[PDB]
DNA sequence: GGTGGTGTGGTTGG
């Protein structure tokens, strides 16, 4: 997260860290959507151009965290994966269309002050909240700036970062890039003419873009950190998987495989 | 419980986090 | 230290 700030304790209790078993490293963000299901970006698990193709046994999920690197002894919970479900029409060859995956935990997780699920939007919520100029909130342990390279240490935060960003009009998203955008995506971030800054960055993928409903006071996950070109560049905007658009797939996986 | 999206340390304690007001204000301005 | 840097802890034991 670029130009964000340190999260408060318990601010994003649905935030999940996807962690590689060996070597021991941050892989991506993710979100907790029940006691047994985590949502993330598909490219965190499957990206053949970078030689990435993780199986269940290669990864863990760490839930309830604040510190990036420390094991938060009596606070975080570590879960293993039963199964990964990648969207069958995830397009890693071209534009990361449908950049979405579900991960079923081997056992349910007990909730706490630090560990709690986000809501997923229904049609009405999505039509109401996913409008240009409304702001949502992105969280992650990714890079603090676009990184020029190749090493990284000072570029990584000590604790989870948060930034609030406005949803951008589709024609603006489209004209900002030559990568083909789809209805399975939306973009967010400030225009150069707005002054304020901020974006997700590498290592933030899979993390949630959430919005707080002014009708019921709940947080809803509207997007998944997916892609961008650089980070926090003027005239560029972060791209997010559009959760509601993919919600029938989400529901089909959980209904058929879930617990 | 059906308590998705309500944070134990914030909504459940009637406590606001430091920047959520920004989000709410964006639905106006 | 333990898959940081300081605590009569901390978002947690000793
Ligand atoms: C895996 C995620 O951590 C990362 C998130 C980047 C978000 N960036 C901004 N500014 N909000 N995603 C990526 O790194 C993805 C995975 C494949 C490459 N990629 C990109 O974002 C490229 N920079 C652009 C791109 C290349 C190919 C297909 C789609 C986009
Ligand atoms: C990802 O790698 C796994 C590991 O065997 C394999 O089963 C799966 O088909 C792979 N997909 C691609 C495109 O490599
Ligand atoms: K300690
Ligand atoms: Na920008």
CATH number of domain containing B25: 4.10.140.10
Q: What is the resolution of this structure in A?
A: 1.7
- What is the gyration radius of the CA atoms in chain B, in angstroms? 11
How many structural domains is chain B composed of?
1
Q: Which of A66, A79, A97, A99 is catalytic?
A: A99
A82: phi > 0 → left, psi -120 to 50 → alpha, else beta; which? alpha
Alpha-helical (H) ranges within chain A are 123-129, 170-175, 247-257
Q: How was this structure determined?
A: X-ray
Q: Which residues contact A83 (CB under 8 A, 6 or more apart)?
A: A56, A103, A104, A257
The rounded distance, in Å, linking the Cα atoms of A188 and A229 is 13
Contact A187, A168 (CB under 8 A): yes
Q: Which residues sit opposite A55 in a β-bridge?
A: none
Distance in angstroms between the alpha carbons of the first and the last residue of chain B: 34
CB A35 within 8 A of CB A109: yes
For residue A57, give the 3-state DSSP assignment.
helix
d(CA A179, CA A255): 34
Q: Hey, what domains does chain A have and what are their CATH numbers?
A: 1-12+118-244 (no CATH), 13-117+245-258 (2.40.10.10)
Mutate to test the interface with B, among A8, A129, A220 (most CBs of B within 10 A): A8
Q: Residue for token digits 């100029």?
A: A133
Ligand 2 atom index nearest CA of A46: 1
What domain range includes position B17?
Answer: 1-29
Catalytic annotation present for A66: no
């Amino acid at each position: 997260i670029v130009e964000g700030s340190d999260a408060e304790i318990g601010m994003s209790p649905w935030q999940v860290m996807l962690f590689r078993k060996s070597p021991q490293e941050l892989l991506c963000g993710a979100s907790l959507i029940s006691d047994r299901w985590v949502l993330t970006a598909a490219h965190c698990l499957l990206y053949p151009p970078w030689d990435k193709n993780f199986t269940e046994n290669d990864l863990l999920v760490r839930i309830g965290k604040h510190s990036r690197t420390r094991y938060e002894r009596n606070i975080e919970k570590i879960s293993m994966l039963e199964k990964i479900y990648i969207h069958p029409r995830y397009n890693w060859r071209e534009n990361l269309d449908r950049d979405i995956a579900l991960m079923k935990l081997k056992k349910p997780v007990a909730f706490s002050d630090y560990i709690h699920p986000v809501c997923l939007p229904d049609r009405e919520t999505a039509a109401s909240l996913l409008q240009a100029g409304y702001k949502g909130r992105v969280t992650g342990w990714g890079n603090l700036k676009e990184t020029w390279t190749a090493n990284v240490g000072k570029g990584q935060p000590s604790v989870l970062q948060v930034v609030n960003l406005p949803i951008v009009e589709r024609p603006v998203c489209k004209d900002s890039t030559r990568i083909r955008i789809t209805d399975n995506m939306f973009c967010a971030g400030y225009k150069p003419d707005e002054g304020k800054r901020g974006d997700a960055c590498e290592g933030d993928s899979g993390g949630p873009f959430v919005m707080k409903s002014p009708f019921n006071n709940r947080w809803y996950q509207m997007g998944i950190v997916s892609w961008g070109e650089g980070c926090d560049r003027d005239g560029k905007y972060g791209f997010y998987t559009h959760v509601f658009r993919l919600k029938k797939w989400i529901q089909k996986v959980i209904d058929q495989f879930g617990e | 419980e059906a308590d998705c999206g309500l944070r134990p340390l914030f909504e459940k304690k009637s406590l606001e986090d430091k920047t959520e007001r920004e989000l709410l204000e964006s639905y106006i301005d």
